[PDB]
């Protein structure tokens, strides 16, 4: 059977945020939780963070390490078929003040062969202290 | 009329390759699943291996070294169909989604290239590390 490949792309435009612990809560944000990105209009500034399980060698038989979460605009990424606000384990919905969550951006997702991940900045206040992320300069 | 056909013939992987960026890149590492998307399959079935292909090209003198290519096969299919998930073998890296049952033997088979094109890789749950790349294939 050929595979059913339905996603237009699953690489987030942005670096992940990482939990600090194996049993960290889901991300919460001081402000909207939408990454800084001036390319979009206010109405279109909404999307979701999605959990990804991570593991390490050895030691072992692989061992778990803390989750990463990646941001996708609504209608893109692994949960592209969800409507904004639909409940799913591992999905946190975010929207800017002034967002119209029925709108759609044409921002799409990132081709990793052509683009490095973009830096995350949250000028309106980022995720809580259960999460960290590597510095990437502007 | 024709005799039986038991093997993976000269079928291919369902999916496009991942390619090393250098002649000395390490084998691919997968912090998340490393299993391509395929909505035919449930989470329990999402496991298999990446297998190295050596590559060479023509040019100055003749034989030129090209970076390694690695191709994905579901467990129980492909050149290493006889292995069980996790069996050591040089040029084989085992992958599985969180929640996979690496004994579930999927039903996707392999690709006859005269009938089906290579399918795009999409990695919901993580792909290979940054030593690897592949061209984007839309659709």
UniProtKB/Swiss-Prot annotation, chain A:
Organism: Avian infectious bronchitis virus (strain Gray)
Biased composition (Basic residues): 48-62
Chain segments carrying region Disordered: 24-62
Taxonomic superkingdom: Viruses
Name of the gene encoding the protein in the UniProt record: N
Domain CoV N NTD per the UniProt entry, residue ranges: 9-134
Protein's name in the database: Nucleoprotein
Post-translational modification (record): ADP-ribosylated. The ADP-ribosylation is retained in the virion during infection.
Task performed by this protein: Packages the positive strand viral genome RNA into a helical ribonucleocapsid (RNP) and plays a fundamental role during virion assembly through its interactions with the viral genome and membrane protein M. Plays an important role in enhancing the efficiency of subgenomic viral RNA transcription as well as viral replication.
UniProt family annotation: Belongs to the gammacoronavirus nucleocapsid protein family.
Localization per record: Virion; Host endoplasmic reticulum-Golgi intermediate compartment; Host Golgi apparatus
Region entry RNA-binding, spans: 7-138
From Swiss-Prot, chain B:
Chain segments annotated as transmembrane: none
Region (RNA-binding): 8-139
Region (Disordered): 25-63
Coiled coil regions in record: none
Compartment(s) where it occurs, according to its Swiss-Prot or TrEMBL record: Virion; Host endoplasmic reticulum-Golgi intermediate compartment; Host Golgi apparatus
Protein encoded by which gene: N
Skewed-composition ranges (Basic residues): 49-63
Region of the whole protein represented: 22 to 160 of 409
Organism classification: Viruses, Riboviria, Orthornavirae, Pisuviricota, Pisoniviricetes
Similarity comment: Belongs to the gammacoronavirus nucleocapsid protein family.
Post-translational modification: ADP-ribosylated. The ADP-ribosylation is retained in the virion during infection. Phosphorylated on serine and threonine residues.
Function: Packages the positive strand viral genome RNA into a helical ribonucleocapsid (RNP) and plays a fundamental role during virion assembly through its interactions with the viral genome and membrane protein M. Plays an important role in enhancing the efficiency of subgenomic viral RNA transcription as well as viral replication.
Domain CoV N NTD positions: 10-135
Protein name: Nucleoprotein
Source organism (scientific name): Avian infectious bronchitis virus (strain Gray)
Quaternary context: Homooligomer. Both monomeric and oligomeric forms interact with RNA. Interacts with protein M. Interacts with NSP3; this interaction serves to tether the genome to the newly translated replicase-transcriptase complex at a very early stage of infection.
